[PDB]
């Protein structure tokens, strides 16, 4: 399985876009939290289908597959969120029909700081001129590398193959050899930012759940608690 | 500055280790916290001199300097802890006479979870055989890549010089171009985990401050509230 086939497959596995519209009424802390959670919940199903299409994921132990998923879902969602919002400064494209403005975050306590984060990070990928093929590779890496802790070996092999796919895609651009290393370094240092946004969001979401301001759905309730 | 000279500036920037010792009686939740917040607080004074000795940091604006330090302080402390602990598996060398074992996390509510992370990441650096020069570059990249932001171009420039320095340090090993790209991605992917550990560590510390188990007072408090 060459780095070329792996990217091809990643493109195929791309999860389709989830559609969600704005509720019929001015956004209240309640309506917003519901819109985002329902959206996240629906997305989580597609992520799982995406993970399993990644060569070698299904071959990992059952408990590691869920360990990697429970650990990276917010990161993977916010990275998808960023790619969508890349060409639209100041906006967050949660869905084709759900494009919140920065200031619109002031409708939910504390989420405004999270919107700024996602916006700045997205702004950073924008300046980097993030390519679609790099995004696909970067997204798959967040998954395989999300968890700290015969199966560990396969994982190692899997992250290795994906890293090799990013390198290759980067090289395909025709830029300097010295630039290949700088760009690789730049894309990866942004993973800490994506990770930081994910940590903060989950904190926020968890507290919304405790403040019981939002009911939980089938699958998302299992991920948050983890 | 050429890579080699930048790395020497980084070496000269390395501050002394803060010495602390095991308290009088066995560890109480309160004394253990007093020990950790006491250690951090004294290390922060050293971390500030360290950052000021990094090429270009003092040329950044006053507010930027503080923004970077407030954003990454914990990440930097944990990374140094990892370096000091890299050769002693199962132990966290907070200081020469403060070597806690995994099972000593059970003295504080919720910090055992953090210890495990800290040891897993350290263990990760150990298997990659992290060389001192690499350690120096990564710690500096953490400070410069911390915040999610004329003085703006000064940073991406600063950061790029340290990355180039790391890129050089890896090349000096003489390994394959492919292995040079893999080692860089593996070292950089780990920054995410460090950031993650830093995030939990602070949530925990902020929580303790509320339970007032830890009397986080001066300097350190300025780093937490932010
Ligand atoms: O409290 C919350 C709830 C949802 C999010 C969120 N961020 O990015 C997203 C991308 C999605 O596709 C679906 C939900 C989110 C958040 O950052 C905080
Ligand atoms: O509540 C707390 C208090 C201190 C720490 C800590 N982690 O790593 C460290 C490294 C240091 O050099 C000094 C303090 C800490 C923590 O993770 C949670």
Tab-separated table of C-alpha atoms and ligand atoms in Angstrom:
chain	number	residue	atom	x	y	z
A	1	UNK	CA	0.000	0.000	0.000
A	2	UNK	CA	1.847	3.046	-1.339
A	3	UNK	CA	1.476	6.573	0.042
A	4	UNK	CA	-0.497	7.282	-3.141
A	5	UNK	CA	-3.071	4.548	-2.560
A	6	UNK	CA	-3.408	5.570	1.106
A	7	UNK	CA	-4.315	9.138	0.231
A	8	UNK	CA	-6.703	7.893	-2.446
A	9	UNK	CA	-8.394	5.689	0.145
A	10	UNK	CA	-8.476	8.549	2.669
A	11	UNK	CA	-10.252	10.688	0.092
A	12	UNK	CA	-12.827	7.910	-0.429
A	13	UNK	CA	-13.343	7.450	3.289
A	14	UNK	CA	-13.990	11.178	3.619
A	15	UNK	CA	-17.083	11.514	5.786
A	16	UNK	CA	-19.977	13.247	3.987
A	17	UNK	CA	-21.150	16.666	5.189
A	18	UNK	CA	-23.809	16.649	7.895
A	19	UNK	CA	-26.609	19.145	7.359
A	20	UNK	CA	-28.172	21.172	10.144
A	21	UNK	CA	-30.144	24.404	9.876
A	22	UNK	CA	-30.588	27.294	12.297
A	23	UNK	CA	-33.563	26.791	14.663
A	24	UNK	CA	-36.799	28.723	14.074
A	25	UNK	CA	-36.114	31.484	16.622
A	26	UNK	CA	-33.345	33.776	17.935
A	27	UNK	CA	-30.451	31.702	19.276
A	28	UNK	CA	-30.715	31.110	23.019
A	29	UNK	CA	-27.996	29.387	25.060
A	30	UNK	CA	-30.342	26.425	24.770
A	31	UNK	CA	-30.949	26.335	21.003
A	32	UNK	CA	-27.241	26.784	20.244
A	33	UNK	CA	-25.989	23.990	22.522
A	34	UNK	CA	-28.592	21.678	20.991
A	35	UNK	CA	-27.654	22.585	17.408
A	36	UNK	CA	-23.970	21.929	18.057
A	37	UNK	CA	-24.487	18.719	20.022
A	38	UNK	CA	-27.008	17.248	17.572
A	39	UNK	CA	-24.558	18.124	14.825
A	40	UNK	CA	-21.632	16.580	16.720
A	41	UNK	CA	-23.715	13.498	17.517
A	42	UNK	CA	-24.609	12.953	13.854
A	43	UNK	CA	-20.986	13.522	12.851
A	44	UNK	CA	-19.669	10.961	15.363
A	45	UNK	CA	-21.438	8.175	13.479
A	46	UNK	CA	-19.682	9.104	10.229
A	47	UNK	CA	-16.298	9.431	11.975
A	48	UNK	CA	-16.528	5.819	13.169
A	49	UNK	CA	-17.269	4.689	9.582
A	50	UNK	CA	-14.301	6.814	8.530
A	51	UNK	CA	-11.972	5.309	11.114
A	52	UNK	CA	-12.775	1.742	10.038
A	53	UNK	CA	-12.055	2.557	6.401
A	54	UNK	CA	-8.531	3.583	7.406
A	55	UNK	CA	-6.290	0.606	6.456
A	56	UNK	CA	-5.299	-1.254	9.607
A	57	UNK	CA	-7.600	0.492	12.066
A	58	UNK	CA	-10.065	-2.405	12.223
A	59	UNK	CA	-7.158	-4.770	12.830
A	60	UNK	CA	-6.307	-3.051	16.113
A	61	UNK	CA	-7.754	-4.496	19.294
A	62	UNK	CA	-11.414	-3.605	19.796
A	63	UNK	CA	-10.661	-1.629	22.962
A	64	UNK	CA	-7.904	0.410	21.296
A	65	UNK	CA	-10.146	1.408	18.378
A	66	UNK	CA	-12.583	2.927	20.903
A	67	UNK	CA	-9.671	4.261	22.950
A	68	UNK	CA	-8.418	6.171	19.919
A	69	UNK	CA	-11.915	7.348	18.993
A	70	UNK	CA	-13.063	8.458	22.459
A	71	UNK	CA	-9.802	10.350	22.697
A	72	UNK	CA	-9.849	12.215	19.371
A	73	UNK	CA	-13.447	12.948	18.335
A	74	UNK	CA	-13.511	16.653	19.353
A	75	UNK	CA	-10.120	17.200	17.708
A	76	UNK	CA	-11.255	15.473	14.511
A	77	UNK	CA	-14.472	17.483	14.468
A	78	UNK	CA	-12.760	20.828	15.077
A	79	UNK	CA	-10.233	20.028	12.323
A	80	UNK	CA	-13.106	19.300	9.943
A	81	UNK	CA	-14.714	22.511	11.185
A	82	UNK	CA	-11.509	24.452	10.419
A	83	UNK	CA	-11.097	23.113	6.894
A	84	UNK	CA	-14.695	24.149	6.051
A	85	UNK	CA	-14.107	27.621	7.514
A	86	UNK	CA	-10.697	28.115	5.886
A	87	UNK	CA	-11.804	30.429	3.043
A	88	UNK	CA	-14.225	32.490	5.156
A	89	UNK	CA	-12.406	34.738	7.652
A	90	UNK	CA	-14.304	35.587	10.814
A	91	UNK	CA	-16.818	32.768	10.343
A	92	UNK	CA	-17.248	29.187	11.565
A	93	UNK	CA	-18.907	26.814	9.102
A	94	UNK	CA	-20.302	24.159	11.439
A	95	UNK	CA	-22.653	23.229	8.607
A	96	UNK	CA	-23.402	24.547	5.094
A	97	UNK	CA	-26.525	26.117	6.600
A	98	UNK	CA	-25.069	26.804	10.065
A	99	UNK	CA	-22.474	29.545	9.699
A	100	UNK	CA	-22.089	31.313	13.026
A	101	UNK	CA	-20.355	34.665	13.309
A	102	UNK	CA	-17.647	35.112	15.941
A	103	UNK	CA	-19.650	37.458	18.179
A	104	UNK	CA	-22.584	35.064	17.867
A	105	UNK	CA	-20.766	32.977	20.444
A	106	UNK	CA	-21.757	35.463	23.126
A	107	UNK	CA	-25.070	33.560	23.249
A	108	UNK	CA	-23.432	30.759	25.246
A	109	UNK	CA	-21.365	31.490	28.346
A	110	UNK	CA	-17.679	30.808	27.790
A	111	UNK	CA	-17.970	29.484	24.249
A	112	UNK	CA	-16.811	32.813	22.810
A	113	UNK	CA	-13.257	32.057	23.865
A	114	UNK	CA	-13.519	28.720	22.084
A	115	UNK	CA	-14.784	30.308	18.885
A	116	UNK	CA	-11.841	32.719	18.892
A	117	UNK	CA	-9.463	29.777	19.319
A	118	UNK	CA	-10.952	27.826	16.397
A	119	UNK	CA	-10.961	31.042	14.310
A	120	UNK	CA	-7.291	31.847	14.984
A	121	UNK	CA	-6.232	28.268	14.307
A	122	UNK	CA	-8.306	28.206	11.113
A	123	UNK	CA	-6.756	31.553	10.201
A	124	UNK	CA	-3.375	29.901	10.693
A	125	UNK	CA	-4.149	27.005	8.326
A	126	UNK	CA	-5.454	29.565	5.827
A	127	UNK	CA	-2.158	31.485	5.809
A	128	UNK	CA	-0.417	28.138	5.458
A	129	UNK	CA	-2.575	27.490	2.372
A	130	UNK	CA	-3.470	24.037	3.712
A	131	UNK	CA	-4.098	21.623	0.814
A	132	UNK	CA	-6.988	19.162	0.767
A	133	UNK	CA	-4.659	16.166	0.589
A	134	UNK	CA	-2.634	17.369	3.584
A	135	UNK	CA	-5.820	17.917	5.563
A	136	UNK	CA	-6.873	14.323	4.866
A	137	UNK	CA	-3.511	13.096	6.120
A	138	UNK	CA	-3.433	15.464	9.072
A	139	UNK	CA	-6.941	14.374	10.061
A	140	UNK	CA	-6.010	10.666	10.020
A	141	UNK	CA	-2.934	11.409	12.171
A	142	UNK	CA	-4.955	13.147	14.866
A	143	UNK	CA	-6.857	9.848	15.175
A	144	UNK	CA	-3.941	7.416	15.287
A	145	UNK	CA	-1.891	9.680	17.571
A	146	UNK	CA	-4.670	10.905	19.855
A	147	UNK	CA	-4.113	8.312	22.565
A	148	UNK	CA	-1.054	8.360	24.802
A	149	UNK	CA	-1.196	4.805	26.157
A	150	UNK	CA	0.967	-6.854	18.789
A	151	UNK	CA	-1.619	-4.054	18.566
A	152	UNK	CA	0.638	-1.203	19.684
A	153	UNK	CA	3.000	-2.357	16.954
A	154	UNK	CA	0.348	-2.177	14.241
A	155	UNK	CA	-0.567	1.309	15.434
A	156	UNK	CA	3.088	2.313	15.166
A	157	UNK	CA	3.087	0.920	11.623
A	158	UNK	CA	-0.118	2.792	10.850
A	159	UNK	CA	0.998	6.233	12.047
A	160	UNK	CA	4.227	5.610	10.143
A	161	UNK	CA	2.406	4.967	6.855
A	162	UNK	CA	0.245	8.060	7.286
A	163	UNK	CA	3.254	10.227	8.112
A	164	UNK	CA	4.822	8.873	4.913
A	165	UNK	CA	1.653	9.833	3.037
A	166	UNK	CA	1.842	13.422	4.272
A	167	UNK	CA	5.535	13.666	3.349
A	168	UNK	CA	4.721	12.372	-0.148
A	169	UNK	CA	1.794	14.760	-0.632
A	170	UNK	CA	4.025	17.631	0.528
A	171	UNK	CA	6.737	16.583	-1.935
A	172	UNK	CA	4.172	16.394	-4.751
A	173	UNK	CA	3.860	20.181	-4.513
A	174	UNK	CA	7.266	20.601	-6.164
A	175	UNK	CA	8.806	22.801	-3.455
A	176	UNK	CA	12.334	22.920	-2.047
A	177	UNK	CA	13.678	19.955	-0.069
A	178	UNK	CA	14.373	22.381	2.782
A	179	UNK	CA	10.813	23.644	2.438
A	180	UNK	CA	9.414	20.128	2.665
A	181	UNK	CA	10.815	19.899	6.164
A	182	UNK	CA	9.621	23.364	7.173
A	183	UNK	CA	6.067	22.751	5.945
A	184	UNK	CA	5.916	19.357	7.598
A	185	UNK	CA	7.046	21.041	10.817
A	186	UNK	CA	4.422	23.796	10.416
A	187	UNK	CA	1.467	21.475	9.797
A	188	UNK	CA	2.426	19.333	12.804
A	189	UNK	CA	3.011	22.177	15.259
A	190	UNK	CA	-0.562	23.218	14.575
A	191	UNK	CA	-1.676	19.845	15.980
A	192	UNK	CA	-0.897	21.179	19.448
A	193	UNK	CA	-3.222	24.068	18.770
A	194	UNK	CA	-5.970	21.805	17.458
A	195	UNK	CA	-5.415	19.632	20.539
A	196	UNK	CA	-5.608	22.659	22.798
A	197	UNK	CA	-8.898	23.758	21.260
A	198	UNK	CA	-10.260	20.231	21.741
A	199	UNK	CA	-9.323	20.135	25.430
A	200	UNK	CA	-11.019	23.482	26.042
A	201	UNK	CA	-14.168	22.627	24.107
A	202	UNK	CA	-14.651	19.326	25.932
A	203	UNK	CA	-14.231	21.183	29.225
A	204	UNK	CA	-16.960	23.556	28.119
A	205	UNK	CA	-19.246	20.835	26.801
A	206	UNK	CA	-18.794	18.729	29.951
A	207	UNK	CA	-19.777	21.617	32.203
A	208	UNK	CA	-22.869	22.411	29.882
A	209	UNK	CA	-23.864	18.780	30.499
A	210	UNK	CA	-23.436	19.093	34.291
A	211	UNK	CA	-25.275	22.408	34.319
A	212	UNK	CA	-27.697	20.077	32.506
A	213	UNK	CA	-28.418	22.894	30.048
A	214	UNK	CA	-28.406	20.291	27.296
A	215	UNK	CA	-29.851	16.808	26.967
A	216	UNK	CA	-27.505	14.103	25.710
A	217	UNK	CA	-28.100	11.926	22.656
A	218	UNK	CA	-27.469	8.247	21.909
A	219	UNK	CA	-23.779	8.182	20.916
A	220	UNK	CA	-22.361	11.541	22.120
A	221	UNK	CA	-23.187	10.775	25.766
A	222	UNK	CA	-20.821	7.811	25.649
A	223	UNK	CA	-17.912	9.843	24.200
A	224	UNK	CA	-18.095	12.736	26.662
A	225	UNK	CA	-18.165	10.577	29.780
A	226	UNK	CA	-15.257	8.373	28.660
B	1	UNK	CA	22.362	32.882	13.388
B	2	UNK	CA	23.214	29.538	11.879
B	3	UNK	CA	21.515	26.455	13.411
B	4	UNK	CA	24.587	25.460	15.437
B	5	UNK	CA	24.839	28.956	16.935
B	6	UNK	CA	21.125	29.072	17.719
B	7	UNK	CA	21.442	25.756	19.539
B	8	UNK	CA	24.347	27.159	21.592
B	9	UNK	CA	22.233	30.147	22.575
B	10	UNK	CA	19.612	27.624	23.666
B	11	UNK	CA	22.206	25.685	25.707
B	12	UNK	CA	23.409	28.836	27.404
B	13	UNK	CA	19.777	29.657	28.118
B	14	UNK	CA	19.277	26.412	30.125
B	15	UNK	CA	18.753	27.503	33.734
B	16	UNK	CA	19.807	25.649	36.933
B	17	UNK	CA	17.587	22.953	38.461
B	18	UNK	CA	15.412	24.003	41.395
B	19	UNK	CA	16.248	21.897	44.439
B	20	UNK	CA	13.487	20.613	46.690
B	21	UNK	CA	13.286	17.683	49.097
B	22	UNK	CA	10.728	15.222	50.429
B	23	UNK	CA	8.836	16.824	53.341
B	24	UNK	CA	9.306	15.819	56.996
B	25	UNK	CA	6.613	13.114	57.269
B	26	UNK	CA	5.169	10.816	54.572
B	27	UNK	CA	3.187	12.549	51.848
B	28	UNK	CA	-0.140	14.138	52.707
B	29	UNK	CA	-2.337	15.468	49.913
B	30	UNK	CA	-1.598	18.992	51.185
B	31	UNK	CA	2.165	18.624	51.591
B	32	UNK	CA	2.477	16.964	48.173
B	33	UNK	CA	0.689	19.925	46.599
B	34	UNK	CA	2.725	22.358	48.647
B	35	UNK	CA	5.771	20.526	47.266
B	36	UNK	CA	4.689	20.736	43.611
B	37	UNK	CA	3.402	24.311	43.637
B	38	UNK	CA	6.500	25.244	45.625
B	39	UNK	CA	8.689	23.669	42.942
B	40	UNK	CA	6.804	25.220	40.013
B	41	UNK	CA	6.724	28.681	41.574
B	42	UNK	CA	10.530	28.671	41.947
B	43	UNK	CA	11.040	27.240	38.434
B	44	UNK	CA	8.963	30.016	36.910
B	45	UNK	CA	11.572	32.565	37.945
B	46	UNK	CA	14.150	30.506	36.053
B	47	UNK	CA	11.857	30.008	33.044
B	48	UNK	CA	11.537	33.778	32.623
B	49	UNK	CA	15.316	34.301	32.445
B	50	UNK	CA	15.422	31.320	30.082
B	51	UNK	CA	12.897	32.839	27.669
B	52	UNK	CA	14.720	36.185	27.769
B	53	UNK	CA	17.916	34.403	26.620
B	54	UNK	CA	16.165	32.924	23.575
B	55	UNK	CA	17.002	34.652	20.262
B	56	UNK	CA	14.390	37.293	19.509
B	57	UNK	CA	12.080	36.855	22.492
B	58	UNK	CA	13.087	40.129	24.187
B	59	UNK	CA	12.633	41.887	20.848
B	60	UNK	CA	8.991	40.818	20.848
B	61	UNK	CA	6.497	43.199	22.449
B	62	UNK	CA	6.026	43.217	26.216
B	63	UNK	CA	2.454	41.898	26.008
B	64	UNK	CA	3.449	39.211	23.490
B	65	UNK	CA	6.289	38.013	25.698
B	66	UNK	CA	3.891	37.670	28.625
B	67	UNK	CA	1.197	36.121	26.423
B	68	UNK	CA	3.605	33.418	25.265
B	69	UNK	CA	4.867	32.653	28.779
B	70	UNK	CA	1.375	32.607	30.350
B	71	UNK	CA	0.169	30.310	27.607
B	72	UNK	CA	2.973	27.745	27.811
B	73	UNK	CA	4.453	27.842	31.304
B	74	UNK	CA	3.088	24.415	32.361
B	75	UNK	CA	4.054	22.819	29.043
B	76	UNK	CA	7.657	23.957	29.563
B	77	UNK	CA	7.777	22.649	33.146
B	78	UNK	CA	6.398	19.264	32.151
B	79	UNK	CA	8.845	18.952	29.271
B	80	UNK	CA	11.787	19.636	31.579
B	81	UNK	CA	10.364	17.070	33.982
B	82	UNK	CA	10.219	14.595	31.126
B	83	UNK	CA	13.852	15.249	30.209
B	84	UNK	CA	15.050	14.838	33.793
B	85	UNK	CA	12.954	11.663	34.054
B	86	UNK	CA	13.840	10.167	30.690
B	87	UNK	CA	16.373	7.715	32.167
B	88	UNK	CA	14.353	6.645	35.216
B	89	UNK	CA	11.227	4.723	34.074
B	90	UNK	CA	8.336	4.631	36.504
B	91	UNK	CA	9.598	7.753	38.236
B	92	UNK	CA	9.115	11.477	37.913
B	93	UNK	CA	12.267	13.400	38.808
B	94	UNK	CA	10.654	16.646	39.879
B	95	UNK	CA	13.986	17.474	41.533
B	96	UNK	CA	17.121	15.523	42.676
B	97	UNK	CA	15.585	14.657	46.055
B	98	UNK	CA	11.967	14.503	44.857
B	99	UNK	CA	11.598	11.303	42.862
B	100	UNK	CA	7.960	10.227	42.994
B	101	UNK	CA	6.841	6.802	41.783
B	102	UNK	CA	3.673	6.179	39.781
B	103	UNK	CA	1.980	4.868	42.961
B	104	UNK	CA	2.653	8.136	44.801
B	105	UNK	CA	0.011	9.849	42.731
B	106	UNK	CA	-2.578	8.111	44.887
B	107	UNK	CA	-1.805	10.745	47.553
B	108	UNK	CA	-3.575	13.499	45.621
B	109	UNK	CA	-7.097	13.286	44.230
B	110	UNK	CA	-6.921	13.277	40.440
B	111	UNK	CA	-3.190	13.823	39.999
B	112	UNK	CA	-2.527	10.093	39.466
B	113	UNK	CA	-4.204	10.475	36.092
B	114	UNK	CA	-1.726	13.235	35.264
B	115	UNK	CA	1.298	11.256	36.451
B	116	UNK	CA	0.382	8.419	34.086
B	117	UNK	CA	0.260	10.857	31.155
B	118	UNK	CA	3.565	12.439	32.139
B	119	UNK	CA	5.245	9.024	32.347
B	120	UNK	CA	3.760	7.744	29.104
B	121	UNK	CA	4.983	10.793	27.164
B	122	UNK	CA	8.395	10.609	28.865
B	123	UNK	CA	8.471	6.953	28.034
B	124	UNK	CA	7.733	8.019	24.480
B	125	UNK	CA	10.734	10.359	24.350
B	126	UNK	CA	12.885	7.608	25.853
B	127	UNK	CA	12.184	5.160	23.040
B	128	UNK	CA	12.890	7.787	20.381
B	129	UNK	CA	16.204	8.230	22.203
B	130	UNK	CA	15.738	11.993	22.619
B	131	UNK	CA	19.142	13.663	22.443
B	132	UNK	CA	19.904	16.752	24.571
B	133	UNK	CA	20.196	19.080	21.577
B	134	UNK	CA	16.735	17.919	20.437
B	135	UNK	CA	15.338	18.483	23.910
B	136	UNK	CA	16.657	22.050	23.817
B	137	UNK	CA	14.952	22.795	20.455
B	138	UNK	CA	11.613	21.255	21.425
B	139	UNK	CA	11.408	23.177	24.684
B	140	UNK	CA	12.023	26.392	22.745
B	141	UNK	CA	9.415	25.444	20.118
B	142	UNK	CA	6.864	24.951	22.902
B	143	UNK	CA	7.311	28.507	24.121
B	144	UNK	CA	7.250	30.000	20.643
B	145	UNK	CA	4.365	27.781	19.367
B	146	UNK	CA	2.267	28.099	22.551
B	147	UNK	CA	-0.258	30.888	22.063
B	148	UNK	CA	-2.879	30.837	19.302
B	149	UNK	CA	-2.240	34.555	18.570
B	150	UNK	CA	5.377	43.538	12.692
B	151	UNK	CA	5.734	41.776	16.065
B	152	UNK	CA	3.580	39.054	14.477
B	153	UNK	CA	6.064	38.220	11.708
B	154	UNK	CA	8.807	38.292	14.353
B	155	UNK	CA	7.388	35.168	15.949
B	156	UNK	CA	6.796	32.955	12.915
B	157	UNK	CA	10.364	33.940	12.044
B	158	UNK	CA	11.718	33.097	15.509
B	159	UNK	CA	9.871	29.798	15.537
B	160	UNK	CA	11.119	28.937	12.068
B	161	UNK	CA	14.755	29.408	13.190
B	162	UNK	CA	14.377	26.923	16.059
B	163	UNK	CA	12.621	24.452	13.776
B	164	UNK	CA	15.439	24.797	11.286
B	165	UNK	CA	17.884	24.261	14.136
B	166	UNK	CA	16.062	21.042	15.118
B	167	UNK	CA	15.944	20.001	11.460
B	168	UNK	CA	19.735	20.414	11.463
B	169	UNK	CA	20.295	18.514	14.698
B	170	UNK	CA	18.447	15.520	13.188
B	171	UNK	CA	20.334	15.720	9.904
B	172	UNK	CA	23.631	15.788	11.790
B	173	UNK	CA	22.793	12.244	12.921
B	174	UNK	CA	23.330	11.279	9.298
B	175	UNK	CA	20.215	9.144	8.953
B	176	UNK	CA	18.146	8.653	5.817
B	177	UNK	CA	16.147	11.559	4.427
B	178	UNK	CA	13.089	9.369	5.052
B	179	UNK	CA	14.148	8.715	8.643
B	180	UNK	CA	14.827	12.437	9.012
B	181	UNK	CA	11.215	13.208	8.090
B	182	UNK	CA	9.859	10.453	10.363
B	183	UNK	CA	11.855	11.518	13.453
B	184	UNK	CA	10.797	15.148	13.031
B	185	UNK	CA	7.089	14.201	12.720
B	186	UNK	CA	7.368	11.849	15.691
B	187	UNK	CA	8.980	14.514	17.879
B	188	UNK	CA	6.478	17.119	16.767
B	189	UNK	CA	3.455	14.847	17.096
B	190	UNK	CA	4.476	14.444	20.734
B	191	UNK	CA	4.094	18.166	21.403
B	192	UNK	CA	0.361	17.510	21.221
B	193	UNK	CA	0.605	15.098	24.136
B	194	UNK	CA	2.712	17.556	26.094
B	195	UNK	CA	0.082	20.223	25.424
B	196	UNK	CA	-2.634	17.744	26.498
B	197	UNK	CA	-0.776	16.911	29.733
B	198	UNK	CA	-0.318	20.624	30.370
B	199	UNK	CA	-4.048	21.199	29.912
B	200	UNK	CA	-5.104	18.512	32.398
B	201	UNK	CA	-2.373	19.557	34.809
B	202	UNK	CA	-3.766	23.075	34.991
B	203	UNK	CA	-7.412	22.022	35.203
B	204	UNK	CA	-6.291	19.891	38.126
B	205	UNK	CA	-4.233	22.683	39.692
B	206	UNK	CA	-7.068	25.165	39.280
B	207	UNK	CA	-9.393	22.682	40.909
B	208	UNK	CA	-7.032	22.156	43.829
B	209	UNK	CA	-6.771	25.915	44.311
B	210	UNK	CA	-10.554	25.932	44.788
B	211	UNK	CA	-10.441	23.011	47.213
B	212	UNK	CA	-7.721	25.207	48.731
B	213	UNK	CA	-5.746	22.013	49.328
B	214	UNK	CA	-2.941	23.889	47.599
B	215	UNK	CA	-2.275	27.455	48.647
B	216	UNK	CA	-1.063	28.555	45.212
B	217	UNK	CA	-0.216	32.154	46.126
B	218	UNK	CA	2.010	34.638	44.280
B	219	UNK	CA	3.810	34.256	40.929
B	220	UNK	CA	2.301	30.856	40.127
B	221	UNK	CA	-1.194	32.266	40.691
B	222	UNK	CA	-0.531	34.819	37.945
B	223	UNK	CA	0.185	31.874	35.616
B	224	UNK	CA	-2.960	29.951	36.605
B	225	UNK	CA	-5.665	32.641	36.581
B	226	UNK	CA	-4.786	33.615	33.015
C	1	LIG	O1	-19.411	23.024	23.792
C	1	LIG	C1	-19.039	22.817	22.630
C	1	LIG	C2	-19.878	22.092	21.711
C	1	LIG	C3	-19.454	21.849	20.352
C	1	LIG	C4	-18.176	22.339	19.921
C	1	LIG	C5	-17.664	22.121	18.499
C	1	LIG	N1	-16.471	22.608	17.988
C	1	LIG	O2	-16.196	22.282	16.756
C	1	LIG	C6	-17.187	21.508	16.318
C	1	LIG	C7	-17.309	20.912	15.047
C	1	LIG	C8	-18.445	20.120	14.809
C	1	LIG	O3	-18.563	19.596	13.711
C	1	LIG	C9	-19.454	19.922	15.826
C	1	LIG	C10	-19.310	20.544	17.126
C	1	LIG	C11	-18.142	21.361	17.364
C	1	LIG	C12	-17.358	23.061	20.865
C	1	LIG	O4	-16.255	23.514	20.581
C	1	LIG	C13	-17.781	23.297	22.206
C	2	LIG	O1	-1.673	20.174	40.525
C	2	LIG	C1	-0.600	20.028	39.930
C	2	LIG	C2	0.601	20.650	40.432
C	2	LIG	C3	1.868	20.492	39.745
C	2	LIG	C4	1.921	19.703	38.553
C	2	LIG	C5	3.223	19.506	37.784
C	2	LIG	N1	3.380	18.723	36.656
C	2	LIG	O2	4.573	18.714	36.114
C	2	LIG	C6	5.344	19.530	36.835
C	2	LIG	C7	6.707	19.847	36.615
C	2	LIG	C8	7.328	20.761	37.514
C	2	LIG	O3	8.517	21.041	37.319
C	2	LIG	C9	6.591	21.354	38.628
C	2	LIG	C10	5.195	21.015	38.833
C	2	LIG	C11	4.561	20.072	37.904
C	2	LIG	C12	0.695	19.087	38.072
C	2	LIG	O4	0.645	18.394	37.063
C	2	LIG	C13	-0.552	19.245	38.752
